[PDB]
A paper describes a structure:
Phytoplankton blooms produce large quantities of beta-glucans, such as laminarin, a soluble β-1,3-glucan with β-1,6 side chains.
The enzyme FbGH17A hydrolyzed both the debranched laminarin product of FbGH30 and the native laminarin, although with a markedly higher specific activity on the debranched product (KM: 1.6 ± 0.1 mM; Kcat/KM: 36056 M−1s−1) than on laminarin itself (KM: 4.3 ± 0.1 mM; Kcat/KM: 25744 M−1s−1). In order to examine the molecular basis of substrate specificity the X-ray crystal structure of GH17A was solved. Compared to the monomeric GH17 structures, FbGH17A has significant insertions and is larger. The structure of GH17A allows for the deduction of the molecular basis of substrate specificity for the laminarinase. Based on the GH17 complexes obtained for R. miehei, a model was generated of a laminarin product involving five monomers bound to the catalytic groove, two on the aglycone side, and three on the glycone side. The reducing and non-reducing ends of the modeled glycan are free, suggesting the protein can act in the middle of the chain as expected for an endo-acting glycoside hydrolase. Furthermore, given the conformation of the modeled glycan, 6-O-β-glucose branching would be possible only at subsite + 1 and anything further away (+ 3 or − 4). In other words, within the native polysaccharide the enzyme would need a stretch of at least three free β1,3-glucose moieties to act. This structural data supports the observation that GH17 activity on laminarin is bolstered by the action of the debranching enzyme GH30. The X-ray crystal structure of GH17A reveals the possible molecular determinants of substrate specificity and the propensity of the enzyme to be more active on unbranched laminarin.
Residue numbers in the entry:
A (entry chain C), B (entry chain B), C (entry chain F): 38 to 430
Write the structure that this text describes.
Amino acid sequence: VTAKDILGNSKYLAISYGGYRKKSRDFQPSIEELKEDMKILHAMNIRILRTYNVRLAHTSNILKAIRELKNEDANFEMYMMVGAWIDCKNAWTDQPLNHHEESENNASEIDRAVALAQEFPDIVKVIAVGNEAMVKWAASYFVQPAVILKWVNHLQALKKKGDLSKDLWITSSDNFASWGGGDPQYHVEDLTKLIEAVDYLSVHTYPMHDTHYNPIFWGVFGDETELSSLKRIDIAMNRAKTYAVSQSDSVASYIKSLGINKPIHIGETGWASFSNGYYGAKGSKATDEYKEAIFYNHIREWTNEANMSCFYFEAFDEPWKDAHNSGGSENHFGLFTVDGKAKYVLWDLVDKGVFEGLTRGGNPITKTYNGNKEALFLEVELPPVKKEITKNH
Amino acid sequence: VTAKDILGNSKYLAISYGGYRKKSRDFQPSIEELKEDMKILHAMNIRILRTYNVRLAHTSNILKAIRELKNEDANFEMYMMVGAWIDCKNAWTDQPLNHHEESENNASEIDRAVALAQEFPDIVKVIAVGNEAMVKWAASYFVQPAVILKWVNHLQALKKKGDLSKDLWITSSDNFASWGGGDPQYHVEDLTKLIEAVDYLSVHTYPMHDTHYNPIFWGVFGDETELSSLKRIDIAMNRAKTYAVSQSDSVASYIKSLGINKPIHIGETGWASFSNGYYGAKGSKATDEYKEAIFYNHIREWTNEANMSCFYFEAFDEPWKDAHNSGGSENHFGLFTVDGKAKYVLWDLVDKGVFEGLTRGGNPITKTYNGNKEALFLEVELPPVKKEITKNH
Amino acid sequence: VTAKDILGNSKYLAISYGGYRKKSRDFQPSIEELKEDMKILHAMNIRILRTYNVRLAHTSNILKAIRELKNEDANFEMYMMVGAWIDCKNAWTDQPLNHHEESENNASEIDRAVALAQEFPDIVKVIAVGNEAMVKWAASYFVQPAVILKWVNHLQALKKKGDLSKDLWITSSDNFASWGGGDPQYHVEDLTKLIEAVDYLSVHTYPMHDTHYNPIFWGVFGDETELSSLKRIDIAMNRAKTYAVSQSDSVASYIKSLGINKPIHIGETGWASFSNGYYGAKGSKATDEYKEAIFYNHIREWTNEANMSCFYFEAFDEPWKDAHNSGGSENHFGLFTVDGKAKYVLWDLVDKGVFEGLTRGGNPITKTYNGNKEALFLEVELPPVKKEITKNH
Ligand SMILES: [Ca+2]
């Protein structure tokens, strides 16, 4: 029934979701198309999904779709974490950006989020104020924590005064460093107040990206060369998992140091199945369906043992994200392909019949590579070999 | 019994052999060590082997080893193609090379070859005058065809006079181009006389090397990108086989144009299982145990259907060949590892029990990768993708 | 009008032609589509075209199209050089190539070429036996000159016997080196006989390609750096023209040395307007519409002053030639784009109204870049700067 009951409870697995099927978000998916996705995710035991803005129709249409499916079937159950997108002044225009001022359009985006939580209170269990909106590298739109605090407080006040349910949880979904787990430049009074104001912290961590941008944890190191190729991948991927755990834990340590006790949940993490830039064959050798599956399963095990939700990125490949370059890793974060093929990670579920009778865009849910593990393994590369310096410890 | 009976007869499979186990040929293998190898090869249906010089003790010791095994077991059968190494003047010294004069040491090398054919006429069926000794790129030692002709004619004269068996076959083992199948620069009078003088032509062809030095045949081309990874390798490797066939056939065409009918046999070809230079991960993606197996089997099928012997390169990895770089492809041409592990190509024979009871240096004959095909496939890379131009044919 | 009247006569400008509009030749253009092209070329003063094979329907359909247009308009005039494609044994199969034997399919290709010259003797003025079929780098299909000679002689015998007009000219269209103007490896008896058997020599020369493969002529050298950009391009492009002239003249010198007098015509040369490989921004800086125009005009001036035809490559961009890579230079040799836009070279003619009322695939003949020379010039790069050594002459 409530966010407190759902989050951290492995009977309600979370996922990040977008239902766009073409190279532009101008092509909005229809309610019928979104219902296809909902049925597929529901069959997999996904019970809560996450969304990014309320400016385009997409989020509103997902709620309509879920409502229709709940009317068709009284046992159908899907919940939503609704994202209200937050911008700095002049974001997405040709005018000079100001990261110390807010977009005049944040107010109406918060208003539209509120309206949706009110029309669909049986589905909407969380509002997230911003998506990576405080991280200092989000050059196109980032804001100061004072702006997120402002809107989180606005939402907490609407709950106090009775315009929103007292059980509706408010958060902001952001990088670990924005929540205080990294550079101490972020450790400002406004962040402390924000950590007080939210009901929980939605934290993002991305080892896959750091296989390029901070690669110290990524490789085959020393004696590992003498191990089996299978074992080398297992060990390397385990380091990737532990790296994420460290970043999450760093946020927990920060909040403990402020004398604040709040739940932490993973709002975003993922590992793409293909890259023609930094993360694939021409760079760090991270991206393929096998390593994606390993990462997904490690993240599930960790989060279910720690009682954290993980809104894993992402349900379906979304080819609008790097529109002019289809091989870009942004287009390959799905557990399924755009056409509804199940990647290695979900082959086991296809075999058990979990998606029987279900369709995406006319296609049945088929295994990628025709379920041929050997054909996948030929395409998989090993992580790069590195040498380790021994410290005199 | 005779070379004419053995060559081109698939009941007598050929191989190129060296028994050195260390990074220098100064460490001669013992007779006991060589017997280990002979037993292994014999178990595999190898019945004739090839050797490169008679200067070091190695070839003489192999003959001693085979003799001991034939005394122990009346059904043991192994034959030898003995290589007499030919040099140009000042080869392997610090004096100026002269490729139009011969080394003074050739004479005694030919004498030693003759002495061995005489002491072991039941084993030695062929003498080869030179190994790639005419090919113009063998900068360290190459000679003109007049010098090979000279020694071939010397050996044919010893046969005529009765000092050697009339059934002993004489050849020279050389690159396809040296035998007239390539640049017409080679098409000189002395080569025509050499082709007349030999009993047969021992021809080398190396697609693996040409994956770097002449790569037009090597890759995944056009529409092939849409095929399965398994199929892509099969197609690419088939082009490699066909390339070798074309080079061998080019020699057959050249001798036919001279009005000469001689048998042709493959004296050398091979595909290494590892390379840290041009042929592996840092270059053409040719070298691994899977592609080696594909090449070996294709060469066996082709040669057995064409009634050619193939002295396939090579039985065992020999780590002295690129002594200062163990990852060099020269050290990885074996069907077995230096420690006696059977590479992918022979896994099937290990499972049938062909090598049971047999040992190399104390080790039983084990499968590489623990016989785990998946582990191998992770290490295998695909050939590079290439541009296909369509001609208006 | 006879081949003798047409070739070398600037009242009958020549061009290489294909009418394919899609990325595969499986999509044959219709007779209606081909008529569109013929009208466009005719408006430009093109009076003879060249074709590459008579296996696919394309060449036959061009003849049908020209015939229809001659029936519609008694002043319409278009002639054809018909290419009979010649292959070596196993070309375009997965079997081993043999460049010393011929394809079993050559005979019927020659038969189909003779049938077309017979059904359309008012249009077909030349048969060309082969297209680059002797050049030793055409690895996929090349043949020995004996094979071309065989079929040229066959055709000359059909003319003698009266099955073909005595005024029909026979040739082979090939690289300057194949005709004896380069490596003397080509200087064999069968070539001399071929030079005697043909009515003329159709010679190909490609400076554009040599800006990568033999770049000694290509660049901005020494003092030229101080010159205007406009002038640096003019000087460099003049060297490209003179390079082609030298290659053509080298063929003329070779036939003179044999005491043979035959006309020489340029069967193929061209300069692509775009390249994403060796010839554009990522390599030699050759390819753009400005340098193409300069080359085209230089080749026209040279050929018209020397009384040579130039079957310039090519009328329209043909995107099937490098099907899997649309930025490949093979797809950009047109004077027009696939959509019927006139590249820089023909802007002047669009302005004079030469193509008024004419259409390709529904589109009028428009200028590329909207006829904005400045917009073109921004995209054009200068040739690379090179080291000039002064000799002591
Ligand atoms: Ca030469």
